[PDB]
Design a protein around this ligand. Structure first.
Ligand code: NAG
Ligand code: NAG
Ligand code: NAG
Ligand code: NAG
Ligand code: NAG
Ligand code: NAG
Ligand code: NAG
Ligand code: NAG
Ligand code: NAG
Ligand code: NAG
Ligand code: NAG
Ligand code: NAG
Lengths: 122, 112, 165, 316, 165, 165, 316, 316
């Protein structure tokens, strides 16, 4: 199972980025799918996490019209960050969290991480 | 929210000697189940993050047994006995307890 | 026990379906086998209460719930097998002896009903009725049907029909 | 005028202490020596019959016991005397007899998927099959538990947990694989020294495998000792193992807790309805005492071993 | 069974407070109730011994001690609670059936004693004393208080009272 | 229960050893003790069936198979120590009650066989036999040895030699 | 002259097989239906009525059961049906049911101090406290046993042999702390892999802690599993340990060994004197039969589960 | 004519329910209350005596119990209530009570040398003896098992696998030695940690010794805990060890399987024949009930725990 992030590569401040991540070599079911941001030299920031059925969870620290999106038929989940203001420059990562936070409380971590993508907002 | 702090920032370690990386934060980092929720991510330069030790002190598939971890509550410790030049990276430590997951400052390891 | 069945009655009749204790009377009006519903009703009610007692006092027996034991538990498996077989043998002995004792008591109780009916008809007509051995009586006075209904009802007056010879 | 009694056209006989074979008039026989010889429903509930299957074959679902995948509400469990498909892989389920005791008060299970096959990201859930447990002439293994072989030549510690948020009790089944030698361990499980640690509010368990040379039962020199627990509501089971884990896949939620039994009978299932069921057959009678068999689920007559119980309700 | 309780006797008279059994006479020299101590005493001592026997047998029955079992010994507890329940159902049965049968014996043994006094008075006074239906007697001769004391004592002599007339 | 012992029959005879139940006559053509062997044989067969029944229900009586238990299994031991004794106590009571009821019944059975014999002779002989209350019929009619022998045989019928003078 | 029977203007009833309600004259009742309804003494000995506590809360002295630190002679032990003060620290006790069984034949303990707190040079005795066992709000732990944690950063091996110089059997209690993870073995003790070796003439134990995760009971996850032994005169108990040792500090000497029971009832203590005790109320009567409860300690009537058990010792 | 009954000169007295000590006529006593006072044969079969010998002193061959070196077919095993020569080395054979259970159905044993003396090379056979067990004053261990000490400053791995080619079941006895300390463990065996593994078709055991400081029983501080199994036809027992192994030498092949009991009686053996046997004597009558003792083995009267049962067969 590998994850492939397809990105725009640049976005002016007004519009919303269109950063998708596609699951290749595996299935979308029964695993949390979470976006993790990396600004240059400011560590790693967790944007959000979407369970396949639903239950989207955003990041309280920053609110930027986050609409984490998921679709099973195409085996894809997507990110959009409208109201961007040039503070979101990041080497974005999609990651497959291997945990269930419901009746099954198993947590095995973000095993699979995408190759990466880059966006320099200007 | 939960804010972590790396106690070491850079460790020049002679290969063949164990190291020590530690981080802590406000809460007790133990869910209702009771299995300490912590992960350490290598993030080698050029590569992407890899699980390494997970759920506190348990090792990922494929990672050799030189990596180990310990600690419960606030205090933690990573330890790489007989470290090797393959083990370079940053070792981000992520608190997985609550919804707003956060990361550490990173420990960039330089080969002595 | 009391000695009526194959006792002072030579044998049971084969003409009376209604009732269990009957009167065979030879009269000018005619002859028929009476049912004597008084003694038979009290005896049938006693037998019904007997059967009710059998099914009520054996309501809570040993419910032999089947339990299993593996190898190396043969001590406790023998304990369970001997416990269930012992309770079964105790309750079998209890039921066997109870039906045996109640068969004896019901045969002797029917015999006592025959002898008490005989004694009830002996107390009435105490001198006018010669007492033949084979559960019979010969009235000295000429008795029509209605005095037989009065004897079988239980209301007989010795000041009536007081003649002897 | 006369005093006497009657007889009848009767040949039935009673026994007393002082005299046996005594004729009676209009007696009542309290012993039912007749049965239909078939298995039927109990108060309109179809029982769970097991044809060449066992409780260990059904709860840990045998591939040759696939008739009971979706079981409706029953009233008693019928097993054969020696079922052939019973722990086809050798071993012994621990407290199997206590588990059969706890299935004598359960009338219905709901088989729920507490742990799916997708919830093993780092282990192999497809190759855990054997030739000692065949299915359609192919290797297979039980369908209610996954034999976890290593994946990518690695077997990490599992540390799986399940919180019972359902409002009913759950019957959770797992096991440990006792292999024959260290070479079989290293072939299957990357870690040589393995354990299974089960933790909950009450039950505490540690299982170190007993690697020993053993004879051949069912074709393979290996054993899988299975274990079970009952998880209460708002109680969490915690399985932790770095090897030899036969992990759960399905659990049996207890939704109807009543009265039942295990009969151990090889009687073909008939199609009728009655209240009292016996292992040999059925009774449809209101007699006080039945000599048919000791075990009788339901409201039934009382067992007496005797062969002739006629209460004399008659003169002679 | 024996048929003197609501048999020979319609009902026992009230006011004879001396034991259970007794006589009654309307002779000129007083007309008051009394009692036959020898027979009543035999019945009393027999009932006392009976009660002593029942309490005697009840010794060394099953004394149910409290054995507890943990969660994983449900088979053993279902053995033990069923052993105790079974032994209790046996001993309760051996109480209830015992005092059911013994009551049926005692209410028929007291009937036996009443009929024993009745037919013992009839053994004596063969021809002198006509036998009334309702468990009574009328002598042909005027029989004083001394003869009634004698038949209480059991030392009656018929050749003295050969006064049939 | 009926009144054989201390009733009409004052006591027992020592000379006669053949037959439990017997007759004595003072007739001119010999005076001796004889036995009514039909009723005695019925009584002996009844007692033999009683003994055979007692040993036939007691064949399935529970036996104590000796099980030993270690020091850390005392509860199980105290269960088997209360089970092997427990059934034994039940069986002891069952064995005691059986020899406390049947023995009384056997006395009553022998008592019944006396009275059933007694009133049989009374019913067969009827009016021509007077009834001394000690139990001796001083016949109104002279009886030879043969008629007495037919009374033992039960073939004596009142139409034969009906003189009551 | 006339013949007949007595009448006594009475309404009491008896039971027969063939009739149910018969009016009776001079019937003697054998069934003691009534009771005083409270617990009290047997022959002057005040019973051990421990309240809101259990046997394991008493023998291992619970901080919530402080009233029984020196127990006088008792005739029986009473515990409430569902006590709350018992095993405050989550745990169990092996042969706890057998310990109750052997305590049912003990009428008196003499609480002796077999091991003092001065016999622990290299081990802490005051830091062994728990928040799940409150004492006036503050954390505390069982008085009888001391949960020895490390002192001075290490846990020297505890090789202590106690010789029974007394002429009576000694009941000696200890335990093992199955911790919840290895970090608590690093913090509470020093050695990761610990053992408890217990040696007697008739006992061998090699207890090892089970170190895996468990759920929350009473706010904590560790489980202290307790054990006991009975030491004969001139017999020696030997304790060897290097961790997890719930060491003894008090033991019980069996002075009086007679007849008692572990009674389960919640009835308050009353002031009376009697020969028999039944859990819902003391019987003070000489009738042959009682319906009050099956378990009765003393010279008591035999239990029969019935109503209206009356013999007809009179006519009619 | 006068109807009467016979009165003998006898003095037999029966006690009815209503009047006790009733005198009777030619009554029959159903209670024996007599015995030979000795042990007799049952149908010509001489029993096993075991004078100051037990099951553990016989199956494992006690050097004191060398009188039963070849045992013929027995009918019943007579142990004494307190045997003085049983487990001369301290210890406890596991499931000794359940082994006595199986030994209550085995009426014949034929010993066989399943493991000959040549079977063990590189180990020391029959030169490991303990002074707890004396023979002629020189020390000597049991003679049906061999306690293998280190022969030549080492211990090769025992790997023996006896395939049961006999058509009968074999009782196989082994054991594990619990040394008093690690110094004795190293002195007697080169390997400190020992992992005695036993495999069967229906059994698996792993045994690790409990090396602990212990008290003295019979002047010894080690405990040899023995184990047993019953093998099946064409079933291979498998033994694997690297120390502390009490290896089997003799196995007791089960020829006859019937009825036997362990009388546990210390009465002297007599030269006599009977049909029924009791712990304190022999019953030589056909009475319905015997009061002598609960335990009996044969066509015997039932136990009645009473002193006087007489079924009156007479009128008085
Ligand atoms: C009983 O059967 C006999 C023949 O065995 C017959 O003569 C008689 O009529 C029957 N009795 C009836 C119908 O009452
Ligand atoms: C009684 O009747 C049955 C009827 O089957 C017969 O077998 C038996 O021989 C008869 N006699 C006895 C003594 O049981
Ligand atoms: C034992 O011997 C039998 C008979 O030769 C053989 O069939 C079998 O394979 C052998 N091994 C086992 C483990 O039974
Ligand atoms: C399980 O979930 C419930 C509901 O969230 C929670 O209260 C409980 O603490 C959790 N864990 C346990 C062990 O019950
Ligand atoms: C069983 O008996 C009941 C009651 O008589 C009746 O209604 C029912 O039809 C019977 N069933 C069968 C299958 O005979
Ligand atoms: C019997 O009781 C009734 C109750 O009304 C009473 O009137 C009557 O006087 C009583 N008789 C005797 C003799 O006590
Ligand atoms: C007997 O009396 C009780 C009350 O004492 C009553 O409930 C019951 O119905 C009565 N039984 C009969 C058969 O009259
Ligand atoms: C205990 O003390 C007694 C008396 O001094 C002594 O004989 C015995 O050997 C001691 N026990 C131990 C195990 O040292
Ligand atoms: C209680 O029993 C005593 C004798 O132990 C007796 O004196 C007293 O009267 C009884 N109390 C009651 C209320 O019956
Ligand atoms: C009984 O004793 C008397 C002497 O008192 C003697 O004449 C008679 O023969 C004896 N009879 C028997 C049957 O022993
Ligand atoms: C009955 O007789 C025995 C034996 O002589 C004697 O010991 C006992 O006391 C007697 N008992 C009575 C009540 O007569
Ligand atoms: C048992 O009794 C019979 C017959 O009296 C006798 O032949 C036999 O030797 C006796 N047996 C004993 C004392 O073992």
């Amino acid at each position: 199972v590998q994850l492939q992030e397809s990105g725009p590569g640049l976005v002016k401040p007004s519009e919303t980025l269109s950063l998708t991540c596609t699951v290749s070599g595996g299935s979308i079911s029964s695993y949390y799918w979470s976006w993790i941001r990396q600004p240059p030299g400011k560590g790693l920031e967790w944007i959000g996490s979407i369970y396949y059925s639903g239950s989207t969870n955003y990041n309280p620290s920053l609110k930027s019209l986050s609409i984490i999106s998921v679709d099973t038929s195409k085996n894809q989940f997507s990110l959009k960050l409208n109201s961007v203001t040039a503070a979101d420059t990041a080497v974005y990562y999609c990651a497959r969290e291997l945990a269930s936070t419901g009746p099954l409380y198993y947590y095995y971590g973000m095993d699979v991480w995408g190759q990466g993508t880059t966006v320099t907002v200007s | 929210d939960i804010v972590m702090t790396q106690s070491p920032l850079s460790l020049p370690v002679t290969p063949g000697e164990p190291a020590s990386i530690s981080c802590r934060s406000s809460q007790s980092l133990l869910h209702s189940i009771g299995y300490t929720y912590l992960d350490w991510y290598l993030q080698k330069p050029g590569q992407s993050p890899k699980l390494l030790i997970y759920l506190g002190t348990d090792r990922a598939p494929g990672v050799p047994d030189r990596f180990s971890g310990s600690g419960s509550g606030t205090d933690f410790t990573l330890k790489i006995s007989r470290v090797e030049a393959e083990d370079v990276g940053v070792y981000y430590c992520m608190q997985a307890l609550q919804t707003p997951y956060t990361f550490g400052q990173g420990t960039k390891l330089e080969i002595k | 026990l009391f000695g009526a069945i194959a006792g002072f009655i030579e044998g049971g009749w084969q003409g009376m379906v209604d009732g269990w204790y009957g009167y065979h009377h030879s009269n000018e009006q005619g002859s028929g086998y009476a049912a004597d519903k008084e003694s038979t009703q009290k005896a049938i009610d006693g037998v019904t209460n007997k059967v009710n007692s059998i099914i009520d006092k054996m309501n809570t027996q040993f419910e032999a719930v089947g339990r299993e034991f593996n190898n190396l538990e043969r001590r406790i498996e023998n304990l369970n097998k001997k416990m269930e077989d012992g309770f079964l043998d105790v309750w079998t002995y209890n039921a066997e002896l109870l039906v045996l004792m109640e068969n004896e008591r019901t045969l002797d109780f029917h015999d006592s009903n025959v002898k008490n009916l005989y004694d009830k008809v002996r107390l009435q007509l105490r001198d006018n009725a010669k007492e033949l051995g084979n559960g019979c009586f010969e009235f000295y006075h000429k008795c029509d049907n209605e005095c037989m209904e009065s004897v079988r009802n239980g209301t007989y007056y010795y000041p009536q029909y007081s003649e002897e010879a | 005028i006369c005093i006497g009694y009657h007889a009848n056209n009767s040949t039935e006989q009673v026994d007393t202490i002082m005299e046996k074979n005594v004729t009676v008039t209009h007696a009542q026989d309290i012993l039912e020596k007749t049965h239909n010889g078939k298995l039927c429903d109990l108060n309109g509930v179809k029982p769970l019959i097991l044809k060449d299957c066992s409780v260990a074959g059904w709860l840990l679902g045998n591939p040759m016991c696939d008739e009971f995948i979706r079981v409706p509400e029953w009233s008693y469990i019928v097993e054969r005397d020696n079922p052939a498909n019973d722990l086809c892989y050798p071993g012994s389920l621990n407290d199997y007899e206590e588990l059969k005791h706890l299935l004598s008060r359960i009338n219905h299970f709901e088989k729920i998927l507490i742990i799916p096959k997708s919830s093993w990201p780092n282990h192999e859930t497809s190759l855990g099959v054997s030739a000692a447990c065949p299915y359609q002439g192919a290797p297979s293994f039980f369908r209610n538990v996954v034999w976890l072989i290593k994946k990518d030549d690695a077997y990490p510690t599992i540390k799986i947990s399940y919180n019972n948020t359902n409002r009913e009790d759950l019957l959770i089944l797992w096991g440990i694989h006792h292999s024959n030698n260290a070479e079989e361990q290293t072939n299957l499980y990357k870690n040589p020294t393995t354990y299974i640690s089960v933790g909950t509010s009450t039950l505490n368990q540690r299982l170190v495998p007993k690697i020993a040379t053993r004879s051949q039962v069912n074709g393979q020199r290996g054993r899988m000792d299975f274990f079970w627990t009952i998880l209460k509501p708002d109680d969490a089971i915690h399985f932790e193992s770095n090897g030899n884990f036969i992990a759960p896949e399905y659990a049996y939620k207890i939704v109807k807790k009543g009265d039942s039994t295990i009969m151990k009978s090889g009687v073909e299932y008939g199609h009728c309805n009655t209240k009292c069921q016996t292992p040999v057959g059925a009774i449809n009678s209101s007699m006080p005492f039945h000599n048919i068999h000791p075990l009788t689920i339901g409201e039934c007559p009382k067992y007496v071993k005797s062969n002739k119980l006629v209460l004399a309700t008659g003169l002679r």
